[PDB]
């Protein structure tokens, strides 16, 4: 179904077009990722986090890298952290464009999708220049980043960033004040603050209901404590408030990107510790220790001291977490992945009480669901 947003089988009980019951059946994209991770080394498991939520690739890489770095007791260098925050905000732009335009497309407003996907294409080009891939980059690694930025990337990121606000403005002209859009979005899928907290909601699904919580502000990571931005807050807990929150979050991401462009420091890009991060190729081809460490890091991988962590980030879809258990070897013993879409879809049935079919379509759109992270 076009409105399904992936391989989702939603079983509904209907009286006329009124929805009496929603039963989301998932698992049509369960690939058994966590067992597979248990069969890999820590570097081999990284590309799985690209494919969990395929619209926020580097954010998932960052969450996993933070978990592994916390377990390794090491620290990424400052330039790497600035690169991580910059590309996390670019990724948030990508995700919010995808969410807003696919929501509008379900509702029926097909045009803004085509306007915004050219911008998405320009950001895919940024991804590709840095890593050689437009989507599953695998750029963020448990030691920093894989490669330094190419010699003219910052200028192009600046050129893109100084035009994007007008595209957001055109989107808002299309949608924000349209009476049809407001009729399809205002007072649809209203959730109270206490219900949102109890059901496990996070991100926009909290902020639309007035709860003042953003993980970048409350539990900052990387260099998020050094950037300035506002957190959008809703008033009514409906789809209109969440749409406004996402648009304003796009604007605040532009703000953060400008700050990151003007504040990128020099230095190395991965932790200067060759028992965790691979050495440079010239060193690998000149020095005995560098060659030994390259060999061992690419065959066996680094060992992680025993212990378990729960690391969470403010991914564009909500709180994204990893419960990572190390038994002391170079392979993870356990990796549980916490995806906000799981709880949001588990609450979809609650949010659709007393609504019609089209309202349920709008609610699925407003929950910002990608089933790679839901099923794993």
């Amino acid at each position: 179904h076009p409105a399904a947003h992936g391989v989702l089988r939603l079983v509904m009980e209907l009286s006329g077009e009124m929805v009496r019951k929603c039963d989301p059946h998932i698992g049509l994209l369960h690939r058994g990722t966590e067992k597979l991770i248990e069969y890999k080394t820590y570097l081999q498991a990284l590309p799985y986090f690209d494919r969990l939520d395929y619209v926020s690739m580097m954010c998932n890489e960052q969450a996993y890298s933070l978990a592994v770095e916390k377990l390794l007791n090491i620290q990424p260098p400052p330039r790497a952290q600035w690169i991580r925050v910059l590309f996390g905000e670019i990724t948030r732009l990508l995700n919010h464009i995808m969410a807003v335009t696919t929501h509008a497309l379900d509702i029926g407003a097909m045009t803004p999708f085509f306007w915004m996907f050219e911008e998405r294409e320009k950001m895919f080009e940024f991804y590709e220049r840095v890593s050689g891939a437009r989507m599953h980059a695998a750029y963020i690694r448990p030691g920093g980043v894989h490669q330094d930025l190419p010699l003219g990337l910052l200028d192009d990121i600046y050129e893109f960033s100084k035009n994007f606000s007008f595209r957001i403005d055109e989107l808002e002209e299309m949608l924000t004040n349209n009476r049809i859009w407001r009729n399809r979005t205002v007072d649809i899928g209203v959730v109270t603050a206490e219900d949102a907290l109890n059901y496990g909601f996070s991100g926009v699904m909290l902020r639309g209901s007035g709860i003042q919580w953003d993980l970048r502000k409350t539990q900052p990571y990387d260099v998020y404590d050094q950037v300035e931005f506002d957190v959008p807050i809703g008033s009514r807990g409906d789809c209109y408030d969440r749409y406004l929150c996402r648009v304003e979050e796009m604007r605040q991401s532009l703000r953060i990107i400008s700050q990151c462009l003007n504040k990128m420091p020099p230095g190395e890009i991965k932790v200067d510790d060759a028992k965790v991060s691979p050495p440079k190729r010239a060193e690998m081809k000149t020095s005995m220790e560098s060659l030994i460490h390259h060999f061992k890091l690419y065959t066996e991988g680094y060992q992680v001291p025993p212990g378990a962590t729960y690391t969470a980030i403010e991914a564009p879809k909500g709180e994204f977490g990893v419960y990572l258990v190390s038994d002391g070897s170079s392979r993870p013993y356990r990796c549980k992945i916490k995806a906000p879409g799981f709880a949001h879809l588990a609450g979809l049935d609650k949010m659709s009480k007393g609504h019609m079919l089209a309202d349920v379509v709008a609610i699925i759109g407003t929950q910002d669901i990608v089933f790679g992270e839901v099923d794993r």
Binding site: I74, D148, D169, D272
Partner: protein, 97 residues
């Protein structure tokens, strides 16, 4: 750019903005596809002296978790996990959209 001025005027009037100022197609202001070679600075551990690895070994400073209250083994003011959060401030930049 290529478009005749009258079409530019019609575009500006319909959109309500000066379209030419912020064109969405990259005409010539982007970086060249060929660049000079880089040099890339070395890390802090690239010293030739006073660089013993045992003084910069983060993996070996991890320890097993500290045990509080094993079961197998004064007023006492009540405590909390952390101090209460401070209330947020209302965005001196733009408080209301």
């Amino acid at each position: 750019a290529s478009a005749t001025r009258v079409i530019q005027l019609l575009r500006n009037w319909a959109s309500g903005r000066d379209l030419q100022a912020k064109l969405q197609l990259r005409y010539q202001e982007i970086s060249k596809r060929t660049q000079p070679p880089p040099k890339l600075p070395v890390g802090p551990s690239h010293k030739l002296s006073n660089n013993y690895y045992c003084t910069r070994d983060g993996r070996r400073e991890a320890m097993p978790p500290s045990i509080v209250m094993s079961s197998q083994k004064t007023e006492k003011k009540a405590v909390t996990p952390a101090p209460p959060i401070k209330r947020w401030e209302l965005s001196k930049d733009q408080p209301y959209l």
